[PDB]
Each structure stands twice: as C-alpha cells, then as structure tokens.
Design an enzyme around this catalytic site. Structure first.
Site, short mmCIF file in Angstrom:
data_model
loop_
_atom_site.label_atom_id
_atom_site.label_comp_id
_atom_site.label_asym_id
_atom_site.label_seq_id
_atom_site.Cartn_x
_atom_site.Cartn_y
_atom_site.Cartn_z
N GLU A 106 0.82 -1.21 0.00
CA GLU A 106 0.00 0.00 0.00
C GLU A 106 0.85 1.26 0.00
O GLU A 106 0.53 2.22 -0.71
CB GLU A 106 -0.94 0.02 1.21
CG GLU A 106 -2.07 -1.01 1.11
CD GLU A 106 -3.11 -0.66 0.05
OE1 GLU A 106 -3.09 0.47 -0.49
OE2 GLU A 106 -3.94 -1.53 -0.25
N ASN A 127 -7.63 9.68 -5.47
CA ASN A 127 -8.50 8.82 -6.26
C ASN A 127 -9.39 9.64 -7.19
O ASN A 127 -9.60 10.84 -6.99
CB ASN A 127 -9.36 7.95 -5.34
CG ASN A 127 -8.52 7.10 -4.42
OD1 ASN A 127 -8.50 7.31 -3.21
ND2 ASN A 127 -7.82 6.13 -4.98
N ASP A 135 -12.51 9.68 -7.52
CA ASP A 135 -13.72 10.24 -6.93
C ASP A 135 -13.44 11.46 -6.06
O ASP A 135 -14.37 12.00 -5.45
CB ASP A 135 -14.48 9.17 -6.12
CG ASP A 135 -13.73 8.69 -4.89
OD1 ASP A 135 -12.59 9.15 -4.62
OD2 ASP A 135 -14.28 7.82 -4.17
N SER A 154 -11.57 11.54 -3.34
CA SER A 154 -11.06 11.14 -2.05
C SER A 154 -9.55 10.91 -2.14
O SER A 154 -8.97 10.83 -3.22
CB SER A 154 -11.76 9.87 -1.56
OG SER A 154 -11.39 8.75 -2.35
N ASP A 209 -6.19 8.66 -0.17
CA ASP A 209 -5.75 7.61 0.73
C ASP A 209 -4.52 8.09 1.50
O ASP A 209 -3.63 8.72 0.92
CB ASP A 209 -5.38 6.34 -0.03
CG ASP A 209 -6.53 5.79 -0.85
OD1 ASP A 209 -7.68 5.86 -0.39
OD2 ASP A 209 -6.26 5.28 -1.95
N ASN A 237 -8.78 5.70 3.50
CA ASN A 237 -9.47 6.56 2.55
C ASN A 237 -10.35 7.61 3.22
O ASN A 237 -11.08 7.31 4.17
CB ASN A 237 -10.31 5.70 1.61
CG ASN A 237 -10.95 6.49 0.52
OD1 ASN A 237 -12.12 6.86 0.62
ND2 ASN A 237 -10.20 6.77 -0.53
N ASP A 285 -15.30 -4.22 9.34
CA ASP A 285 -16.38 -4.08 8.37
C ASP A 285 -16.54 -5.41 7.63
O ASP A 285 -15.72 -6.32 7.76
CB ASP A 285 -16.08 -2.92 7.41
CG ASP A 285 -17.35 -2.21 6.94
OD1 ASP A 285 -18.45 -2.55 7.40
OD2 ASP A 285 -17.23 -1.30 6.09
#
Ligand code: CL
Ligand code: CL
Ligand code: NA
Ligand code: TB
Ligand code: TB
EC number: 3.2.1.17
Length: 129
Positions: free
Chosen positions: A35, A46, A48, A50, A52, A59, A101
């Site tokens: 990562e 990203n 969209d 957002s 990271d 994120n 999650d």
C-alpha cells in the site's frame, strides 16, 4: 517515516494487530509494504476526489476527515493528517475498525491482489518478535 520491515512488524504486534480478526501479523506487514512501501507519509488521490493516507492508505471518503472530500464520513473520528504520523497508533486503531467491516482485509486492494493466498509469514521471517 519509512519503517523497516521488522521494525514495523514489532510496532504492529505491540498495538495488537497480530491475529486481529484472525489476520496473522504477516498479512498486515504485507499490506503495508504494497500500500505505502512502509512510508507513513504516503498519499494517493482517487478519481472520486477522495485521498488515501498513510502506511495503510486509509481513505477519506469513509474513515477520516481531510476537509476536501464532500459528503464524506469520518468513521475513525480523526483528521486524515493524523494518519501520516511517525507514530502509527492512529492508523492501527482506524485499521481495526476497517477490518471489522463486512469485507475484512479485502478492503485493501493491494492486500487482495498481492498478499491474499501467498506465504505471508515470509514478511516477518528473520524478525525478533
Ligand atoms: Cl504471519
Ligand atoms: Cl474476515
Ligand atoms: Na470525511
Ligand atoms: Tb452491514
Ligand atoms: Tb449495513
């Protein structure tokens, strides 16, 4: 800060990631390697809008507030900049929420594509743990 492999493994173990939700320590070290290349200061934008953040590339759409991700949640209740610290506590505590999650470590694309199903224990071999 750029961690050494065994230095990061020891820090993650102290913060309780070894076998957290059933994921052995090597999974977490492998995820951090691909990562962020072990760099707490890594950021990636990203499409969209957002971003990271940090050693586990957490994120801003869901997990932290960076002030520029509209309609975002801050489920870890932290500014995203806290995830860039040389102290990984904030990143680890938020990662524990993420992995709880529904999707587990599949939330991390690099783990899914480069660690899952491999000999992840190799990432902690030779370390004094
Ligand atoms: Cl392991
Ligand atoms: Cl799981
Ligand atoms: Na947010
Ligand atoms: Tb649900
Ligand atoms: Tb639901």
């Amino acid at each position: 800060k750029v961690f050494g492999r065994c230095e990061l493994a020891a820090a993650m173990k102290r913060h309780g990631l070894d076998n957290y939700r059933g994921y052995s320590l090597g999974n977490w070290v492998c995820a951090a390697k691909f990562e962020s290349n072990f760099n707490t200061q890594a950021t990636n934008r990203n499409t969209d809008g957002s971003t990271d953040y940090g050693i586990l590339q957490i994120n801003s759409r869901w997990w932290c507030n960076d002030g520029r991700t509209p309609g975002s949640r801050n489920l870890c209740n932290i500014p995203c900049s806290a995830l860039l610290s040389s102290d990984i506590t904030a990143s680890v505590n938020c990662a524990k929420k993420i992995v709880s999650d529904g999707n587990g470590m599949n939330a991390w694309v690099a783990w899914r594509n480069r660690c899952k199903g491999t000999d992840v224990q190799a990432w902690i071999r030779g370390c004094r743990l």
